[PDB]
Amino acid sequence: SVDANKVKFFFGKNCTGESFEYNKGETVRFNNGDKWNDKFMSCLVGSNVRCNIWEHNEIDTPTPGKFQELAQGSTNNDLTSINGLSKFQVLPGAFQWAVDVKIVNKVNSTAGSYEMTITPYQVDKVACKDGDDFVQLPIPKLTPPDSEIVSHLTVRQTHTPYDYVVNGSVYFKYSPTTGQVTVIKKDETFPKNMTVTQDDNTSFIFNLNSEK
Ligand SMILES: [Ca+2]
Ligand SMILES: [Ca+2]
Ligand SMILES: [Ca+2]
């Protein structure tokens, strides 16, 4: 059986062919240059976890790709309507949606010595050091989705001089229309020394262009 707290995916309708298992609060990419990215046919999604699948994380481009929000507490004997899912997100009942975040040096030619800490509206604050892989920032029940969640971004060198590099605020927003996340940043809250580019749908890459 499927656990109410985990998910599982099989390469054959009615659970046949091959088997796979995924814990809550994880993200994977299953693709090999557009062919066997699918690797699914029957899956089960526990009554206290959700799945979110995204073709090629389309950025509201002039072609909508393929996307499905596997309803928390359901079984899918076939999803071939949405063969398009080169990215997979598996999230607990505690977390409504989650966002890929990463840090890149555009001035500090050292890495690891630069540590960024982000904390959205009373969430589990997350700190990552420039050189680790993409961090995941889960967000709890955020209803209505089109609301703007207040968030705080602060980045500080872990090595002398270790002053606050920048300290400011940011705003995140969600859209269930295509499971898109969008970030709103203004000179009144966000600094002019870091910027964040939308590398993909639900994927944000912060680059530091001024140590001040
Ligand atoms: Ca594909
Ligand atoms: Ca989109
Ligand atoms: Ca299929």
Whose atoms come closest to the Cα of 35: which ligand? 1
Q: Burial, 149: exposed, middle or buried (Cβ in 10 Å; 0-12, 13-18, 19+)?
A: middle
Q: Which phi and psi (to 5°) does residue 202 adopt? A: 60, 25
Contact 204, 183 (CB under 8 A): yes
CA of 155 to the centre of ligand 2 (A): 29
Token pair listed for 2 = 């499927």
Query: CA-to-CA distance for 190 and 144, rounded, in angstroms?
Result: 24
Contact 152, 185 (CB under 8 A): no
Query: CA-to-CA distance for 177 and 116, rounded, in angstroms?
Result: 31
* Sheet with 135-139: strands ordered across: 135-139, 97-105, 203-208, 194-200
With a CB cutoff of 8 Å and minimum separation 6, the contacts of 186 are: none
Q: Which phi and psi (to 5°) does residue 40 adopt? A: -150, 155
CA of 94 to the centre of ligand 3 (A): 29
Q: Which residues pair with 153 in a beta bridge?
A: 118, 168
* Structural domain spans, the chain: 1-92, 93-212
Whose atoms come closest to the Cα of 84: which ligand? 1
Q: Which phi and psi (to 5°) does residue 77 adopt? A: -70, -25
Whose atoms come closest to the Cα of 79: which ligand? 3
Token pair listed for 195 = 């910027």
Which residue bears the tokens 């240059």?
33
Torsion sign across C-alpha atoms 110, 203, 98, 192 = positive
> Is domain 93-212 annotated with CATH 2.60.40.1720?
yes
> Is domain 1-92 annotated with CATH 3.30.70.2390?
no
Q: What angle do CA 56, 112, 198 make, to 5 degrees?
A: 25
Token pair listed for 77 = 């004997």
**DSSP string of the chain, one letter each residue:** ---TT-EEEESSTTT-S-EEEE-SSEEEE--SSSSS----SEEEE-TTEEEEEEBS---S-SS---EE---SSEEES--GGG--BSEEEEEETT-SEEEEEEEEESS-TT-SSEEEEEEETT---EEEEBTBPPEEEEE---SSTTSEEEEEEEEEESSSS-SEEEEEEEEEEEETTTTEEEEE--TTTS-SSEEEEEEETTEEEEEE----
CA of 111 to the centre of ligand 3 (A): 41
State which residues have CB under 5 angstroms from ligand 3, the bound ion. Answer: 38, 41, 80
Q: Which residues pair with 91 in a beta bridge?
A: 50
With a CB cutoff of 8 Å and minimum separation 6, the contacts of 209 are: 106, 107, 193, 194, 195
